[PDB]
Amino acid sequence: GTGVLTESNKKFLPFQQFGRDIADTTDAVRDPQTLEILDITPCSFGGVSV
Amino acid sequence: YSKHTPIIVREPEDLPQGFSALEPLVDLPIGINITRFQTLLALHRSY
């Protein structure tokens, strides 16, 4: 996917690797290389009106 | 899926009526069919 990767304060239990939002879309992940909790936020967007 | 806690319940027959969750502890990849289960007890010597 495409988004902004940041550190996340949400604590994952040791078995947990993925996090999901209300919309059932992946919102957080654990990096395969180093076990760390990272949340994904979509890149900035907004309607444009002239 | 296991979980351990300390309990101070007065009635041993009465499991606590408190909400709890059992985390996924271990998985075994073997797919051997199992029909019957036997609890294993430790019992050493006359004292």
Ligand SMILES: *[C@@H]1O[C@H](CO)[C@@H](O)[C@H](O)[C@H]1NC(C)=O
């Ligand atoms: C290889 O993978 C393990 C599991 O994530 C990790 O702990 C280890 O640091 C990795 N090796 C290197 C050199 O980073």
